[PDB]
């Protein structure tokens, strides 16, 4: 974590090692490897565990930080507790090591105690396996509402829950680490004086030490007639912001992804989006359905590769050597007189009825290093997270079919199978049958039924900038608006959604996506490129658009009169639309008082129907239990005789 | 029908006033049909004009650079004299 982004499961991994290495003895005042395999504990609905010598079983953790209890994948999330009361130096983090050690101490005051902990403890949660992103971020959550200055670099200021738990469930920052007192630590670059050894200048700071260092996030690209040391930059000090000379700076924050969580760090051009849309974007990316065919984004942040590696979805070699044999089911790798057979997951159901499936990424005779990729899982191409598709998009109103968040799409996304996904539903019949819930029986143990779902009206799509939409209309390709090269667009988004939501980053992404597709390029851009120069994103996008226009002889791609926009034509009539329209190829994902109103209208008989009496008869009996009687009498207006209603 | 001939522009407050006058003059059954026709006309024209939004359309006023640079200069001078002890911290905070 000193010169690379740390493994996203490192907190879970190191905590479990501490429990085995030191935690067991502290509570006991031998461990035997499990007899079954992890895939067996899932197939037989058993528990992956080790034998303590026979005191009982101790559940073991996977390298991905997950436990297998009664066949269910479970993750123990981190809790933050009181050790300014909201300062993180007065808080402490209790990880899986603290929780598993408490259970062992509770157990010694061994099997049923851990089965009951994983099944009932609120910090033990079923792993969200919707997509590779959901698996990796679940274990990094912090459970307890305001942002505190001590959070910077440790707790993400954007990623939180929506509803009533907002500000009480957060995410750990990408470079965060748990210290030796349950404290969160973040790395900073130390500016050292002339006379000091200073082997490693990267140091981790606990929240207590943070206030008393001068921490700057600016750069040193500024010179006047004076000297560089006297130039001023914004810095943090004593939980406030100053403007001081460089020579008074103690530390520098240099990591591009230091201050944000994984979800926020997957948003290109995030600095051009309002911070509220970046929160909504993090939630939407956790709802993205893996597609039957996967495709890398043209424009990314560069963190997609880290998510793929740490998720465990792909297959990575545990040993170097050469590839000898590959098929749909296995890959055979041999190195240094040792041959290994690696099975491949095929059409496996996940927690949320999504389809997991691995495809080989290597051929026979290819040399492999230890830790290199072998196969691509679902929503992963070439070792990168791939949650969506790059499609041709225009921003314009279209006859009210994209009113508000409604989205108009072309039929080519349907018959092209662009957004078709597999969904395997398990119900607790001959194999391969077509039952009618329509689908195909794929595995009988429990019956597993596979559904191929193409995109439909009513489905929800979203970009990475909090731009979420619902498909309202599917048009033939000849009815869609089309470009000056004749190609019809695939989706039409409402342009009125951008100014109100203030997410300009989608405008940068779509233009750059179009340039990349024409130039056969992908872009991985770290956030906050404005630190290099003013309008850095605008310079990057416009220059790449012009290069795409020049190289491919497509002048409409870069119009000097209005860069990024071009005149397009109505497919129905062939006439051009009056004003130029922004077009591009963004990455789009596919996602998984009434009584008073009636009384105000005076609709008395409608209200009576919607209420119907058993509600009142049951009320009388409950009042009778308190020695109270509630009698309903009708007095006749004709003869004044009182009638007791049968209640 | 003795409708007045508008000849300048129809914005949000102008259409709201017109609908209220149509309701008071023609009643709600007439105005409900008028609303459907006006709604259709607005959607059709919005599509034909095809308003959009690009980077260039996000126009900053010409004088922002002058104004920001002037504010930076005054803040920079005050920060120096704060370090000299000529103004106190509350004065720097207010400015």
């Amino acid at each position: 974590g000193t010169s690379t982004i740390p493994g996203f499961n490192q907190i879970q991994f190191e905590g479990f090692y501490r429990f085995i290495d030191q935690g067991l003895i502290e509570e006991l005042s031998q461990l035997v490897e499990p007899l079954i395999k992890e895939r067996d504990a899932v197939y037989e609905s058993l528990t992956y565990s080790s034998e303590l010598y026979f005191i009982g079983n101790i559940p073991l953790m996977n390298s991905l930080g997950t436990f297998i209890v009664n066949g269910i994948y479970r993750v123990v999330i981190n809790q933050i507790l009181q050790s300014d009361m909201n300062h993180l130096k007065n808080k402490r983090i209790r990880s899986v090591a603290d929780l598993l050690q408490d259970q062992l101490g509770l157990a010694l005051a061994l099997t049923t105690t851990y089965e009951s902990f994983f099944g009932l403890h609120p910090l033990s949660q079923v792993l969200d396996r919707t997509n590779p992103l959901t698996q990796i971020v679940h274990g990094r959550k912090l459970s307890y509402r305001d942002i505190h200055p001590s959070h910077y670099g440790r707790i993400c200021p954007i990623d939180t829950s929506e509803g009533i738990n907002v500000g009480l469930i957060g995410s750990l920052s990408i470079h965060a680490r748990i210290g030796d007192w349950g404290s969160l630590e973040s790395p900073f670059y130390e500016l050292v004086e002339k006379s000091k050894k200073a082997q490693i200048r990267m140091l981790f700071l606990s929240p207590s030490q943070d206030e008393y260092y001068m921490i700057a996030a600016g750069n040193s690209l500024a010179l006047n007639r004076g000297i560089q040391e006297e130039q001023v930059v914004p810095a943090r000090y004593r939980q406030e912001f100053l403007t001081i000379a460089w020579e008074e700076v103690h530390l520098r924050s240099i990591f591009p992804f230091q201050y944000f969580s994984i979800g926020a760090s997957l948003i290109p051009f995030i600095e051009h989006n309002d911070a509220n849309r970046a929160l909504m974007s993090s939630n939407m990316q956790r709802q993205a359905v893996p597609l039957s065919r996967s495709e890398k984004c043209i424009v990314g942040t560069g963190l997609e590769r880290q998510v793929a590696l740490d998720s465990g979805v792909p297959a990575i070699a545990e040993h170097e050597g050469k590839i000898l044999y590959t098929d749909t089911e296995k890959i055979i790798l041999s190195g240094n007189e040792n041959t290994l057979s690696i099975p491949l997951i095929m059409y496996q159901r996940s927690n949320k009825n999504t389809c997991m499936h691995q495809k080989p990424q290597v051929r026979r005779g290819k040399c492999i290093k230890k830790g290199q990729i072998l196969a691509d899982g679902a929503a992963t191409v070439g070792g990168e997270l791939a949650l969506g598709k790059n499609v041709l998009v225009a921003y314009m109103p279209w006859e009210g079919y994209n009113f508000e968040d409604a989205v108009l799409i072309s039929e080519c996304l349907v018959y092209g199978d662009i957004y078709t996904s597999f969904h395997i539903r398990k119900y607790e019949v001959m194999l391969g049958s077509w039952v009618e819930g329509r689908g195909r029986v794929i595995d009988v143990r429990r019956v597993y039924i596979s559904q191929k779902r193409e995109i439909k009206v009513g489905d929800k799509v979203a970009g990475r900038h909090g731009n979420k939409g619902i498909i309202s209309k599917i048009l033939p390709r000849q009815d869609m608006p089309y470009l000056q090269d004749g190609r019809p667009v695939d989706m039409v988004f409402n342009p009125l959604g951008v100014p109100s939501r203030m997410n300009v980053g989608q405008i940068f992404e779509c233009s750059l996506g179009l340039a990349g597709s024409l130039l056969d390029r992908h872009y991985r851009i770290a956030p906050f490129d404005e630190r290099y120069e003013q309008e850095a994103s605008r310079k990057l996008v416009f220059s790449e658009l012009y290069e795409a226009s020049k190289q491919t002889a497509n002048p409409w791609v870069f119009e000097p009169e209005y860069p990024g926009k071009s005149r397009i034509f109505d497919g129905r009539t062939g006439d051009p639309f009056e004003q130029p329209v922004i077009i591009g190829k963004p990455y789009i994902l596919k996602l998984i008082m009434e009584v008073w109103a009636l009384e105000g209208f005076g609709v008395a008989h409608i209200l009576q129907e919607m209420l119907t009496p058993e509600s009142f008869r049951l009320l009388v009996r409950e009042l009778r239990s308190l020695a109270l009687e509630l009698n309903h009498f009708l007095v006749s207006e004709k003869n004044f005789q009182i009638n007791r209603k049968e209640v | 029908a003795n409708l007045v001939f508008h000849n300048k522009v129809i914005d949000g407050t102008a259409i709201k006033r017109l609908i209220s006058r149509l309701i008071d003059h023609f009643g709600m059954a007439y105005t409900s049909h008028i609303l459907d026709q006006v709604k259709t006309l607005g959607f059709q024209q919005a599509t034909a004009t095809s308003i959009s939004l690009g980077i260039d359309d996000l126009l900053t006023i010409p004088s922002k650079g002058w104004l920001v640079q002037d504010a930076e200069q005054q803040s920079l001078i005050l920060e120096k004299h704060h370090h000299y002890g000529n103004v106190h911290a509350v004065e720097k905070l207010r400015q």
Binding site: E399, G400, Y401, F403, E404, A406, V457, G458, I470, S472, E622, L623, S625, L626 | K39, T40, F43
Partner: peptide
């Protein structure tokens, strides 16, 4: 009365007093 009666699972008993007290747009 003060501390209410509780069962073995540390739950306060409820008396009778406690008992009594998708859409898609169509422009056409």
């Amino acid at each position: 009365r003060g501390q209410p009666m509780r069962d073995g699972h540390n739950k306060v008993y409820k008396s009778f007093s406690d008992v009594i007290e998708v859409i898609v747009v169509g422009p056409s």
